[PDB]
């Protein structure tokens, strides 16, 4: 596979997102790291899908809403950042105030 350090680390994010998605599916209000993981993995998968940075900045604000998460979680998350390989190489995505 020739995994580099970032590729190894970022597998964890996908895994944490999978965990959080299962928790959501069984009806739990998500907590801070769960919410962050879901949105982060969404960004990384979107890059893999070939979306633009601008598309992901928009979409990232609609992945989870305040009724999906515990009290105070929306206000704990000021922004979520992820770097991923787009068709045009690595780029940084910042999603500002992802959960209203």
């Amino acid at each position: 596979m020739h995994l580099n350090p970032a590729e190894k680390e970022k597998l964890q994010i996908f895994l944490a997102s999978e965990l959080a998605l299962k928790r959501k599916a069984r009806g739990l209000k998500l907590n801070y790291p769960e919410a962050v993981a879901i949105i982060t993995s969404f960004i990384m998968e979107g890059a893999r899908d070939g979306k633009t940075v601008a598309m992901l900045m928009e979409e990232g604000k609609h992945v989870l809403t305040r009724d999906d998460v515990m009290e105070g979680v929306p206000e704990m998350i000021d922004d979520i950042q992820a770097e991923a390989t787009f068709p045009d190489g690595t780029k940084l995505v910042t999603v500002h105030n992802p959960i209203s």
Partner: protein, 570 residues
């Protein structure tokens, strides 16, 4: 020109009279005073103040009142106060708390807090800064426990062990000169301050004392090695000669005596009573009465902190498993029921709140959680506010009195107990720069940056491959203070005066900073900051009811805690 307070606090952190919520608790701390000069706040970045000829002085060499490091705009939470200041560090020590910058052009600059060519900057605006936690009940069982401790703001581990040997799994003991030497050498690779306890057991002085001379920083008396009157007596005689502290986990079984017999053997000498409530060990059922005595420095361990609805079920089973006890053997069941008591655990919450139990600790990996001393301190304070109300001593709706009482339990008081408060345990000038930055939303839960000897040792930081350090995954990671030979300069190995005089560090090739243990034998409960109460604690032998001043101490267990499921992935 004037700035509204919301905007001021957003830019520079809070100022006098402003309050901040601790994590998701109901606890609020209020800024008591502020060392700044409004308009001359220090800050760093593009177009900011700390630039050459401006807030940074371009004239002075490092020796000439210039800092190695300035933490700008810190909200300090300490036994000494809750207040706003810049913190200046030099040669790994806190040298100034006040106002940093450039006397060329700024008013009110503390004279030895010049930002110069030599000065690094950490922005602490909007952070709470505390001393590093001092955990005095550490079992050295698994080296992975160190990062666990750092991640919750602990910077000093006092205890014992040689790894997952049964003696170490049960007791905070590194026994004998050889094991002590081996563990002093191991310590060279642990990125945290360390002091090692010898076995406080023997009927002759020499076998116990030779551990002190070998480099131990104290002793542990534990019932698993025989917490007999003889072992208690000899250990205290050694300690009084050597100027080191003795910790005790007393005879739960009451085999050679009851509490009064252990107290008689102690004979008025200073001693640190571990897990004083007794679920963690000690004379059944009344060990917690130790915490009323003037010569006892009393600590709790953390799994009983605070009293919750799962506590008893969890502890009863934990005890049964750990002691290989059988549910169908009545002596085993009777033992467990005599040791795990809702009456004393509930009272323990209240005794903390009243300043009768002076210290917190972990009991890491031997009936306690290495990364939850700080966490559970604040959960306890929060529970007590909810159940007992703001303390009478409070003012202006703040929880400052409670916050100082509780922060003292894991910072300054363990340091004083151990004889190491000249070096660590508080944010004061002249002490080692072991500092923990917290985002208020994560306060007491997950440290932002842990500074050890003036260099960052541990941080919550993101992708190392990214353009900037904040992208995911943000996780706790060892920083440059832990790498190469810098681990030697950023950490202290605390040792007895005699081992230092006898040249043990040179003999063993220890390169870490060497700290001297001292002034442990002429202290008492009165010296425990904000937690100095002595009183007659009565524990009913029939009902286990705890009374202080004729009043039963009881409270309810809670179903939910703050600093819990909002934060943790598991």
């Amino acid at each position: 020109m004037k700035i509204n307070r919301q905007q001021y606090a957003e830019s520079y952190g809070p100022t006098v009279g402003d309050q901040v919520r601790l994590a998701d608790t109901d606890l609020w701390i209020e800024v008591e005073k502020d060392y700044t000069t409004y308009g001359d706040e220090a800050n760093f970045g593009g177009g900011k103040v700390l630039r050459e000829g401006m807030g940074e002085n371009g004239t002075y060499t490092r020796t000439e009142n210039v800092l190695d490091l300035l933490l700008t705009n810190a909200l300090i939470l300490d036994y000494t106060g809750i207040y706003k200041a810049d913190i200046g560090v030099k040669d790994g020590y806190i040298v100034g708390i006040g106002k940093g910058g450039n006397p060329d052009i700024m008013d009110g600059v503390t004279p030895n807090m010049i930002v110069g060519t030599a000065t690094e900057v950490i922005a602490a605006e909007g952070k709470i800064v505390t001393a590093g936690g001092i955990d005095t009940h550490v079992h050295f069982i698994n080296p992975d426990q160190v990062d666990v401790a750092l991640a919750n703001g602990i910077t000093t581990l006092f205890g014992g062990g040689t790894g997952p040997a049964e003696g170490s799994k049960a007791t905070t003991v590194t026994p004998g000169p050889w094991n002590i030497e081996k563990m002093l050498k191991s310590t060279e690779g642990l990125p945290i301050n360390v002091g090692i306890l010898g076995k406080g057991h023997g009927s002759s002085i020499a076998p116990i004392m030779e551990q002190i001379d070998a480099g131990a920083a104290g002793l542990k008396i534990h019932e698993d090695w025989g917490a007999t009157p003889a072992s208690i007596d000899r250990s205290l005689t050694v300690a009084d000669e050597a100027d080191v502290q003795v910790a005790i986990h007393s005879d739960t079984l009451n085999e050679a005596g009851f509490l009064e017999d252990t107290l008689r053997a102690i004979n008025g000498r200073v001693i640190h009573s571990f897990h004083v409530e007794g679920a963690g060990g000690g004379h059944a059922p009344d060990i917690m009465a130790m915490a009323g005595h003037p010569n006892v420095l009393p600590s709790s361990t953390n799994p009983t902190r605070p009293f919750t609805v799962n506590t008893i079920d969890e502890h009863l089973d934990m005890l049964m498993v750990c002691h290989h006890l059988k549910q169908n053997i009545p002596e085993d069941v009777a033992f467990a029921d005599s040791r795990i008591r809702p009456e004393t655990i509930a009272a323990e919450d209240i005794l903390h709140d009243l300043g009768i139990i002076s210290m917190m600790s972990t009991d890491a990996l031997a009936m306690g959680r290495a990364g939850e001393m700080v966490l559970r301190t604040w959960q306890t304070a929060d529970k007590m506010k909810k159940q007992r109300g703001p303390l009478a001593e409070e003012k202006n709706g703040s929880d400052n009195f409670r916050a100082k009482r509780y922060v003292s339990k894991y910072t300054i008081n363990p340091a004083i107990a151990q004889g190491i408060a000249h070096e660590v345990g508080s944010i004061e000038e002249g002490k080692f720069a072991d500092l923990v930055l917290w985002e208020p939303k994560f306060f007491g839960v997950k440290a932002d940056r842990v500074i050890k000897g003036g260099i960052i040792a541990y941080a919550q930081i993101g992708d190392p491959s990214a353009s900037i350090p904040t992208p995911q995954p943000v996780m706790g990671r060892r920083m440059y203070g832990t790498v190469g030979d810098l681990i030697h300069d950023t950490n202290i190995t605390f040792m007895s005066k005699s081992s230092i005089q006898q040249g043990v560090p040179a003999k063993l090739g220890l390169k870490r900073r060497i700290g001297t243990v001292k002034n442990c034998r002429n202290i008492g409960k009165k010296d425990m900051k904000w937690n100095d109460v002595t009183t007659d604690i009565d524990i009913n032998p029939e009902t286990y009811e705890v009374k202080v001043d004729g009043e039963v101490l009881t409270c309810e267990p809670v179903k939910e805690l703050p600093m819990a499921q909002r934060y943790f992935l598991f």
